[PDB]
């Protein structure tokens, strides 16, 4: 049948449950699954010391340290540092066992459990490829991936070159397709289609060939955005059908190769490159080995035909294993389809985008820019007001965009402050954000005490400020204004809600600062002089430097205004140094203090940059390998120290200091 040759099965196989179970357990070649298993294990082994964070465990989980942490469940706590090193050691052993094929299921579990424990301990570390690694480990735990090229085959005769069920390939192919397609659909946002996300990514030197026929704006609009959307929406279909798999392979390989250099996403691109051949014939590695020299073949996996296996169903009544496998392949894929669109039961995790970041396949769609953050507290007994340094007890900045993390941060601060003689504190937050070059605006209500504010996982947060999407059309005029400025001038665009005010201290350096109204009506107050003046559309006002001024929004709708300022101090210093250098140069040519230190420092930095630029490519690559070598060696030595402490016991303090000094030594 045409459908038989085009889809690999027939409508008759879906007639009944027994036929479906029989089809899903059809004997298949295990070679491609084995190659993917090896590559995935190898990449996990490489990734553990670098992005999973094994080389900074001592810094992250230092004992006796005051830190505010962001776990998914508030009752989840980390272990002491030595037990953290033990957990990471078990994870590494599991990854190695998965890569080798030795004790496949136990190794899968040993990688899986620690990985998800570490993943769920920190919400601020979630991204898409870590979630994908967890998903891949979970899938492979139930598969027969150790049936072709593995130590288990040498140890057991029944698992050497044996058939595998077809749902093993079906689930992996479905997962890859889901990744691609959900990313493509998420790329249908207006900001993406209009070219607002990654508007400056086309300046990279890799895009040089395209610029021979297109302008920079046209390149960014067409190639980056539209080509990315098209690849996402068509890659799965291109790879599935075998009349178009060559073009699909070429395009996907080029895409991932470019992405591996444009961004820093760890092993994501390499994992996708390794997953691409999963759509090819299941026996492709065996065919490749077929064309190898006889002497070489003695070092390569078997090339004969696979033997029958109990896993598959042959042209018998299916048993429990086959029915469980079919049920898994159905339910898991259905859940994977549903989850990225489930942000209507968990209403407490939506602020401006949907949900927590990491399980929706929306990569590089939204870009944020923060202008200012303020934290205020009031003593519960004395009543005095104070201000905290933003991010005082935190190791990440992701708390600024999520209400659950802000609630956790406020609780941590309220518990920690009493040890500095601040009793029953009330804490207020004031954060200004801009997403995809919009007006800067508040994201949380600045008059709400977050310590006592109400938060629930399944209820929409009350104290989140709505995003002002009616002001999006202003972006063109904003960009025009910004591009019309002089090279020593800067501008900030702000939009404020009715009934709110902005209190601003202008630094003494920022001489010649002014404010102009764009929409609505605002009242500007000079705090020192106690004077009120009202502005109208297009009216500008000069502001004093080194004083306070307040902007009240009295319009019934949000107002828009911009700040234009010049750094008077920097300009004067620059001019003086320039004249000094010119005079010295003229004296040296033949004609004719902190400033001298600044001039010499500038020259010193410039000289270093010149040498940095003029560096042989080989030298740079050599340094790259040495840096990577250091990272790995330090991780290994620290793990050894912690394991020894766990087993034998803690040695003398001087011994520990010497051991740490040895571990911290640079390579070669």
């Amino acid at each position: 049948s045409r459908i038989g040759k085009l889809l690999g099965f027939e409508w008759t196989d879906l007639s009944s449950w027994r036929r479906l179970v029989t089809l899903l357990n059809r004997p298949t070649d295990p070679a491609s699954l084995a190659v993917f298993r090896f590559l995935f294990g190898f990449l996990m082994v490489l990734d553990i010391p670098q992005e999973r964070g094994l080389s900074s465990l001592d810094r992250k989980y230092l004992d006796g340290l005051d830190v505010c942490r962001f776990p998914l469940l508030d009752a989840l706590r980390p272990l002491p540092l030595d037990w953290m090193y033990l957990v990471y050691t078990i994870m590494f052993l599991g990854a190695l066992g998965m890569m080798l094929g030795l004790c496949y299921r136990i190794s899968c579990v040993l990688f899986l459990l620690p990985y998800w424990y570490v993943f769920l301990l920190d919400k601020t570390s979630w991204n898409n490829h870590s979630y994908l690694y967890g998903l891949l480990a979970f899938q492979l735990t139930f598969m027969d991936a150790n049936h072709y090229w593995s130590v288990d085959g040498l140890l057991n005769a029944h698992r050497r070159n044996a058939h595998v069920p077809l749902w093993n390939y079906a689930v992996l192919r479905g997962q890859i397709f889901i990744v691609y397609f959900i990313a493509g659909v998420a790329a249908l946002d207006a900001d993406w289609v209009e070219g607002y996300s990654m508007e400056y990514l086309s300046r990279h030197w890799l895009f040089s060939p395209f610029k021979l026929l297109l302008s920079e704006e046209l390149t960014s609009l067409l190639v980056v955005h539209w080509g990315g959307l098209l690849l996402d929406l068509s890659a799965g279909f291109l790879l599935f059908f075998d009349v178009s798999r060559s073009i699909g392979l070429f395009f996907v390989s080029y895409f991932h190769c470019m992405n591996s250099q444009l961004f820093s996403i760890g092993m994501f691109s390499y994992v996708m490159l390794a997953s691409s051949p999963l759509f090819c014939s299941p026996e492709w590695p065996r065919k490749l080995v077929s064309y190898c020299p006889r002497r070489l073949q003695q070092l390569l996996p078997l090339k004969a035909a696979p033997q029958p296996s109990v896993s598959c169903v042959y042209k018998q009544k299916p048993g429990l294993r086959h029915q469980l496998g079919a049920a898994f392949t159905l339910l898991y894929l259905l859940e994977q389809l549903f989850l990225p669109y489930s942000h209507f039961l968990t209403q407490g995790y939506n602020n401006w985008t949907n949900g927590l970041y990491g399980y929706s396949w929306d990569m590089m769609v939204h870009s944020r820019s923060h202008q200012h953050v303020k934290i205020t507290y009031r003593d519960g007994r004395t009543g005095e007001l104070g201000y905290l340094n933003p991010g005082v007890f935190t190791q990440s900045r992701r708390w600024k965009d999520h209400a659950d993390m802000l609630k956790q941060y406020a609780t941590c601060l309220s518990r920690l402050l009493p040890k500095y003689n601040v009793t029953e504190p009330q804490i207020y937050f004031d954060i200004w954000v801009s997403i995809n070059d919009r007006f800067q605006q508040r994201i949380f209500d600045p008059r709400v005490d977050i310590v006592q504010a109400a938060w629930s996982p399944f209820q929409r947060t009350s104290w989140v400020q709505p995003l002002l999407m009616d002001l999006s059309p202003w972006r063109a005029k904003l960009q025009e204004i910004k591009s019309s400025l002089d090279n020593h001038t800067e501008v900030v665009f702000i939009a404020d809600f009715p009934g709110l005010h902005l209190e601003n201290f202008v630094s003494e350096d920022l001489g010649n600062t002014s404010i102009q109204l764009l929409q609505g009506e605002v009242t500007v107050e000079l705090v020192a002089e106690q004077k009120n003046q009202t502005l109208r559309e297009g009216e500008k006002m000069q502001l004093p430097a080194g004083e306070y001024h307040k902007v009240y929004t009295t319009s019934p709708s949000p107002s828009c205004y911009m700040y234009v300022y010049v750094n008077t101090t920097e300009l004067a210093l620059e001019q003086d140094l320039a004249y000094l250098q010119e005079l010295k140069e003229k004296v040296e040519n033949g004609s004719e203090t902190p400033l001298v230190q600044t001039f010499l420092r500038r020259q010193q930095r410039l000289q270093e940059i010149e040498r940095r630029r003029n560096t042989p490519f080989h030298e740079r690559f050599f340094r790259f390998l040495l840096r990577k070598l250091y990272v790995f060696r330090r991780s290994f030595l620290m793990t050894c120290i912690s394991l020894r402490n766990l087993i034998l016991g803690r040695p003398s303090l001087e011994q520990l200091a010497q051991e740490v000094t040895y571990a911290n030594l640079r390579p070669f």
Binding site: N127, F263, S367, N389, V492, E503, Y563
Partner: peptide, 27 residues
Amino acid sequence: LFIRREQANNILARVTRANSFLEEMKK
């Protein structure tokens, strides 16, 4: 830990702009 009122209300302090891609491993 604690700072002054002049610092807390300094909106136009130097420059504050970043790509802030949640996919990229910042550190």
